[PDB]
């Protein structure tokens, strides 16, 4: 077993408008092995019902996944996606920059 | 259509 | 009967040295592997050879698979009495969950030797001092001649049988008939089968 | 346009707490349609695209059968692997498998594939000609010689040039509405001023299918790669894709920059500028 | 060539009261994973009862009713009839293969017969019928005929012994026994064999001949209430010396 570190991108399904429904997306890629914990935080609080894609990989054999949840973004609210992996010394938290 | 895979290494 | 492997059965009498071709037709298109199996009467099936698309030669034996038309062929050159047996078409394919082997009812081959100097005769064998049976033997008859089961239940007639006196390199057909029933005589027995008009009928 | 079908298996040994976890998924091009999870409650091949539901019970039964059987086949290879590599039984290991076919615009068989990877490293693979194999190490050299003497290639060549293409074709037509469609990228561009005499011009490409897209950042009629920050294409989760490439730009030189977006769903390549 | 001794079944022959339970055994030394229990009935061919793809697991086949298996270990796979039935009278074959879908190697197979009552079992009567005078004079060759009859079940092997050694040259035994009453089930069977020899040889009174028939009947653990002698597994034979002109 030679391990690989996950890449993270947090974003929304559609460009965000405060009050308008949307979907919160965290996408981990180029990682190995398959085992990975991934949570969605509404200001440092784990979100109750979050679905995930089917475990699939690239020609690199590196795995990729999408975690997502129905939400309504607000001006104050700051969303993040917390990833834990074997390769990680402690969970890597990545906040949703709504311009990224 | 999935493959008819049954062979061993 | 519903069968994913179908094989024309029925004895296939063929002369020794003659070529025999056999065929088998499989339904399930998703068949993955193909095989021929030789099974001797009263015995177990033995893998004869696996059949591939690229073609499979093995001396006397030759076999092809036609995935397109979904049939396999086995062809035996210079057939020998030895390779008289039932040939089973076997194909694997996904039964439930797990790839599995389907067996044909099998086609049965009967290679027969040509009798150089036939001598059709029906002899009456000496009685076992303690058996009330007249016992009749029809031997040295042309391989073409074939014996037929008796009209009478009380008359027991055993089918043809090729024996090899390797010692003197001589082969002989033979079929045996026994009854204890009165009105049973050796000349009488086998009249239910079409025997050479030459057959020798002595009174020992 | 050439189309493709891929299935992707993933066996993971979890010693002393159950048979390995097996997760197989199928895609036509960049759209997935079926999946199977050795642990999910279905214990059946589940649909994922709207159009594959069209398939009758026979399809689902046979599909379920094939993949479950594959799950066993690899669960055992996971064991075989350990021996071949003199590894411990207490270690967790990964056997990913991939098979598929390509079809041309015509629908003709273009190319087939079949390859295994132990702990994320090429193990064995069927060559372009679907007649011989390419084994990674002395370990697979064993499995190679096994599979050579069994004519396994022939067996696979038959699937790839047959069932595989037949299905890819049926699917493209069954779900013609979805699969042959080419969602164009809804592209815009926003200003991100940074420090002094500097800003960020983020070239957006949103809700496009398929994921094959190329972004160019050209200033002054000249292509620029040094200040370009292009993230790997990402999914939208709705069955579309996304991508952005930003450039750090001096204050007032914003109107001198153009973005070039090429995609299958576009009549012609797009050109974008800072629109205040 | 290959003796395929990899797969071993036991017993080769069994007979049962319809009530009785019974277990066949199978073993493969070849280190295969998948073992199978088949059932060959005439005019239907091989039909699978149960199978075992791996060392741990088993699954039902085409006809698993009245039957149950247990793959006790990598090598052994047991078929068990909890309560026999005439219906279950067949030939049973067991077989193993590297894994599922791989060429199968088969055991010798086991011939099992179920009867409403063991009183229906009978060992063979073997009699030898000495060459025809007519034959020795016409053809300069003597055909001995041996008749094993009234045996049930059809579990018999028939050898020819010339001067204490078994012969094969000059022999031809019926491939299969005969139902004396083909109509009735539980019909006793009859076998017929023929040894042939040069008249000179047969006329020599030092030459001795025996028709030997092994029969597979009951075991002294079984129960016999019938006045007749208990029809246990045994070798019935008939004897004949040479006689000169």
Task: Say whether C17 sits in a helix, a strand or coil.
Answer: coil
Task: Say whether E83 sits in a helix, a strand or coil.
Answer: coil
Spatial contact of D9 and D22, defined as CB atoms under 8 Å apart:
yes
- Cα–Cα distance, D201 to A77 (Å, whole number): 25
Nearest chain C residue to B6, by CA: C99
Spatial contact of D158 and C67, defined as CB atoms under 8 Å apart:
yes
- Cα–Cα distance, A96 to A8 (Å, whole number): 11
- Do both C76 and C152 map to the same domain? no
- Domain end, chosen from C93, C112, C131, is at C112
**CA end-to-end span of chain E:** 46
Buried b (16+ CB within 10 A) or exposed e, D50-66: ebbeebeeebbebbbbb
> Which one of 2.60.40.10, 2.70.170.10, 1.20.1050.10, 3.40.50.20 gives the CATH number of domain E7-116?
2.60.40.10
- Do both C100 and C129 map to the same domain? no
Nearest chain A residue to D96, by CA: A61
Angle (CA) E118 E120 E121, round 5°: 75
Cβ separation B5–D73 shorter than 8 A? yes
- Do both C154 and C77 map to the same domain? no
Q: How do E110-115 and E13-17 pair as beta strands?
A: parallel
- Do both D217 and D164 map to the same domain? no
Q: At which residue do the structure tokens 């977006």 appear?
A: D261
Residue D144 forms contact with C (CB below 8 Å): no
What are the backbone angles phi and psi of residue E166, rounded to the nearest 5°? -65, 140
Return the DSSP state at E19. Answer: T
Distances (CA, A) of E40 to C88, C127, E49, E94, E180: 13, 39, 10, 11, 23
- Cα–Cα distance, D100 to D219 (Å, whole number): 42
Strand partners, A65: A28
Domain that holds residue D170: 3-179
**Ranges assigned E (strand) in chain E:** 7-10, 13-17, 22-28, 34-41, 45-52, 59-60, 67-70, 78-81, 90-97, 105-106, 110-115, 125-129, 141-151, 156-162, 165-167, 171-173, 178-179, 189-198, 208-215, 234-241
Q: Which residues contact D264 (CB under 8 A, 6 or more apart)?
A: D1, D182, D210, D212
- Domain end, chosen from D179, D200, D227, is at D179
Distances (CA, A) of A58 to A30, A55, D77, D98: 8, 11, 22, 10
Number of domains in chain D: 2
| Domain ranges for chain E | 7-116, 119-241
How many Cα atoms occupy the beta-carbon half-sphere of E97 within 13 Å? 20
Q: How do C12-15 and C107-112 pair as beta strands?
A: parallel
- Cα–Cα distance, C133 to C189 (Å, whole number): 13
Angle (CA) A16 A18 A22, round 5°: 45
How many Cα atoms occupy the beta-carbon half-sphere of D228 within 13 Å? 21
Q: Is chain A touching chain B, with at least 3 CB–CB pairs below 8 Å?
A: no
> Measured between CB atoms, which of D5, D77, D140 is closest to B8?
D77
Exposed/middle/buried for E47, CB within 10 Å: 0-12, 13-18, 19+? middle
Q: Is chain E touching chain A, with at least 3 CB–CB pairs below 8 Å?
A: no
- Do both D142 and D13 map to the same domain? yes
Spatial contact of A1 and A23, defined as CB atoms under 8 Å apart:
no
Q: Which chains touch D (3 or more CB pairs under 8 A)?
A: A, B, C, E
Spatial contact of E226 and E119, defined as CB atoms under 8 Å apart:
yes
Spatial contact of A62 and A32, defined as CB atoms under 8 Å apart:
yes
Spatial contact of A91 and A40, defined as CB atoms under 8 Å apart:
no
Q: Which two tokens stand for residue A25?
A: 């997306």
Cα-only R_g, chain C = 22
Return the DSSP state at C145. Answer: -
Q: Which residues contact D69 (CB under 8 A, 6 or more apart)?
A: B4, B5, B6, C94, C97, C98, C99, E100
How many Cα atoms occupy the beta-carbon half-sphere of C151 within 13 Å? 7
- Domain end, chosen from C97, C112, C127, is at C112
Gap from A22 CA to chain D (nearest CA, Å) = 11
Cβ separation A57–D27 shorter than 8 A? no
**Residue D198, domain CATH:** 2.60.40.10
Cα-only R_g, chain A = 14
Of E233, E222, E227, E206, the C-alpha closest to E17 is: E222
Exposed/middle/buried for C64, CB within 10 Å: 0-12, 13-18, 19+? middle
Spatial contact of D126 and D114, defined as CB atoms under 8 Å apart:
yes
Residues of D in Cβ contact (< 8 Å) with E54: 72, 76
- Cα–Cα distance, D204 to D217 (Å, whole number): 12
Structural domain contains residue D184: no
Q: At which residue do the structure tokens 């153009």 appear?
A: D258
Residue D155 forms contact with C (CB below 8 Å): yes
> Measured between CB atoms, which of C33, C52, C97 is closest to D65?
C97
- Cα–Cα distance, D224 to D194 (Å, whole number): 19
- Cα–Cα distance, C122 to C176 (Å, whole number): 9
**SS3 string of chain A?**
CCCECCEEEEEECCCCCCCCCEEEEEEEEEEECCCCEEEEEECCCECCCCEECCCEECCCCCEEEEEEEEECCCCCCCEEEEEECCCCCCCEEEECCCCC
Q: At which residue do the structure tokens 């001067």 appear?
A: E163
Of D104, D98, D97, D102, the C-alpha closest to D112 is: D102
Q: Which two tokens stand for residue D11?
A: 């066996």
Q: At which residue do the structure tokens 């500097």 appear?
A: D198
| Domain ranges for chain A | 1-100
Domain that holds residue C11: 5-112
- Cα–Cα distance, C139 to C147 (Å, whole number): 11
Strand partners, D24: D36
Q: Which two tokens stand for residue D273?
A: 């500028």
Number of domains in chain C: 2
**SS3 string of chain D?**
CCEEEEEEEEEECCCCCCCCEEEEEEEECCEEEEEEECCCCCCCCEECCCHHHHCCHHHHHHHHHHHHHHHHHHHHHHHHHHHHCCCCCCCCCEEEEEEEEEECCCCCEEEEEEEEEECCEEEEEECCCCCCEEECCHHHHHHHHHHHCCCHHHHHHHHHHHHHHHHHHHHHHHCHHHHCCCCCCECCEEEEECCCCCEEEEEEEEEECCCCCEEEEEECCEECCCCEEECCCEECCCCCEEEEEEEEECCCCHHHEEEEEECCCCCCCEEECCCC
Residue E190 forms contact with C (CB below 8 Å): yes
Angle (CA) D164 D166 D168, round 5°: 70
Q: Which residues contact E137 (CB under 8 A, 6 or more apart)?
A: none
- Cα–Cα distance, D202 to D187 (Å, whole number): 10
What is the side-by-side order of every strand in the sheet holding A92-95?
A: A37-42, A79-84, A92-95
- Do both D143 and D11 map to the same domain? yes
Exposed/middle/buried for E113, CB within 10 Å: 0-12, 13-18, 19+? buried
Cβ separation C128–E180 shorter than 8 A? no
Of A69, A72, A89, A73, the C-alpha closest to A81 is: A69
Cα-only R_g, chain D = 23
Q: Which residues contact C102 (CB under 8 A, 6 or more apart)?
A: C3, C4, C5, C26, C28, C90, C91, C92, C93, C95
Fold of E119-241: Immunoglobulin-like (2.60.40)
What are the backbone angles phi and psi of residue B5, rounded to the nearest 5°? -95, 120
- Do both D199 and D135 map to the same domain? no
**Residue C101, domain CATH:** 2.60.40.10
Spatial contact of E181 and E199, defined as CB atoms under 8 Å apart:
no
The CATH number that domain A1-100 falls under is 2.60.40.10
What are the backbone angles phi and psi of residue E136, rounded to the nearest 5°? -60, -30
């Amino acid at each position: 077993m030679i391990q690989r570190t996950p890449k993270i991108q947090v974003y929304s399904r559609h460009p965000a408008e405060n009050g308008k429904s949307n979907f919160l997306n965290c996408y981990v890629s180029g990682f190995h092995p398959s085992d990975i914990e991934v949570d969605l935080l509404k200001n440092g609080e784990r979100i109750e019902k979050v679905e995930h894609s089917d475990l699939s990989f690239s020609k690199d054999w590196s795995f990729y996944l999408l975690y997502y949840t129905e939400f309504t973004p607000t001006e104050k609210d700051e969303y993040a996606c917390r990833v834990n992996h074997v390769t990680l010394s402690q969970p890597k938290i990545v906040k949703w920059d709504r311009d990224m | 259509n999935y493959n008819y895979l049954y062979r061993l290494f | 009967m519903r069968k994913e492997v179908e094989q024309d059965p029925g004895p296939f009498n063929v002369p020794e040295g003659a070529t025999v071709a056999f065929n088998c037709t499989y339904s399930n298109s998703a068949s993955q592997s193909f095989f021929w199996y030789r099974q001797d009467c009263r015995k177990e099936p033995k893998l004869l050879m696996s059949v591939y698309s690229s073609g499979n030669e093995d001396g006397r034996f030759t076999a092809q698979l036609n995935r397109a038309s979904q049939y396999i062929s086995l062809l035996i050159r210079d057939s020998k009495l030895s390779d008289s047996a039932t040939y089973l078409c076997v194909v694997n394919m996904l039964r439930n969950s797990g790839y599995a082997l389907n067996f044909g009812k099998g086609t049965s081959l009967l290679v027969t030797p040509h009798i150089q100097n036939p001598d059709p005769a029906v002899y009456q064998l000496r009685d076992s001092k303690s058996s009330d049976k007249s016992v009749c033997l029809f031997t040295d008859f042309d391989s073409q001649t074939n014996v037929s089961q008796s009209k009478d239940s009380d008359v027991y007639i055993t089918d043809k049988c090729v024996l090899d006196m390797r010692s003197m390199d001589f082969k002989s057909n033979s079929a045996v008939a026994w009854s204890n029933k009165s009105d049973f005589a050796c000349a009488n027995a086998f009249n239910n089968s079409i025997i050479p008009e030459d057959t020798f009928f002595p009174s020992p | 346009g050439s189309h493709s079908m891929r299935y992707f298996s993933t066996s993971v040994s979890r010693p002393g707490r159950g048979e390995p976890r097996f997760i197989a998924v199928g895609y036509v091009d960049d759209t997935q349609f079926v999946r199977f999870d050795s642990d999910a409650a279905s214990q059946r091949m589940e649909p994922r695209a709207p159009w594959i539901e069209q398939e009758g019970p026979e399809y689902w039964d046979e599909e379920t059968g094939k993949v479950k059987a594959h799950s066993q086949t690899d669960r055992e290879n996971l064991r075989i692997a350990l021996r071949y590599y003199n590894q411990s039984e207490a270690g967790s290991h990964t056997l990913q498998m991939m098979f598929g076919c390509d079809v041309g615009s015509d629908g003709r068989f273009l190319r087939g594939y079949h390859q295994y990877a132990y702990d994320g490293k090429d193990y064995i693979a069927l060559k372009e000609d679907l007649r011989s194999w390419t084994a990674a190490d002395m370990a697979a050299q064993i499995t190679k010689r096994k599979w050579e003497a069994a004519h396994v290639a022939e067996q696979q060549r038959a699937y790839l040039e047959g069932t595989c293409v037949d299905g890819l074709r049926r699917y493209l037509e069954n779900g013609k509405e979805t699969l042959q469609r080419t969602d164009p990228p809804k592209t815009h561009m926003t200003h991100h001023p940074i420090s002094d005499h500097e800003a960020t011009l983020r070239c957006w490409a949103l809700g496009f299918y398929p994921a094959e897209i190329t972004l160019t950042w050209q200033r002054d009629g000249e292509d620029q790669t040094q200040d370009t920050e292009l993230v790997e294409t990402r999914p939208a989760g709705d069955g579309t894709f996304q991508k952005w490439a930003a450039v750090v730009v001096p204050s007032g030189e914003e109107q001198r920059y153009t973005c070039h977006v090429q995609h299958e769903g576009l009549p012609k390549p797009l050109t974008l500028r800072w629109e205040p | 060539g290959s003796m395929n001794a990899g797969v071993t079944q036991t017993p080769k022959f069994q007979v049962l009261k319809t009530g009785q339970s019974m277990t066949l055994q199978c073993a493969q030394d070849m280190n295969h994973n998948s073992m199978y229990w088949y059932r060959q009935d005439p005019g239907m061919g091989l039909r699978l009862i149960y199978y075992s793809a791996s060392e741990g697991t088993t699954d039902k086949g085409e006809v698993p009713n009245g039957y149950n298996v247990s793959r006790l270990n990598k090598r052994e796979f047991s078929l068990r009839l909890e309560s026999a039935a005439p219906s279950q009278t067949s030939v049973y074959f067991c077989a193993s293969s590297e894994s599922g879908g791989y060429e199968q190697y088969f055991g010798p197979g086991t011939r099992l017969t179920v009867t409403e009552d063991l009183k229906n079992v009978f060992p063979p009567e073997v009699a030898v019928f000495e060459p025809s005078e007519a034959e020795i004079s016409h053809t300069q060759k003597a055909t001995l005929v041996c008749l094993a009859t009234g045996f049930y079940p059809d579990h018999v092997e028939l050898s020819w012994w010339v001067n204490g050694k078994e012969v094969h040259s000059g022999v031809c035994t019926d491939p299969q026994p005969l139902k004396e009453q083909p109509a009735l089930n539980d019909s006793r069977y009859a076998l017929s064999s023929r040894l042939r020899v040069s008249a000179t040889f047969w006329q020599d009174p030092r030459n001795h001949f025996r028709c030997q028939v092994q029969f597979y009947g009951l075991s002294e653990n079984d129960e016999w209430t019938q006045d007749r002698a208990k029809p246990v597994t045994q070798i019935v034979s008939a004897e004949a010396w040479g006689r000169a002109d």
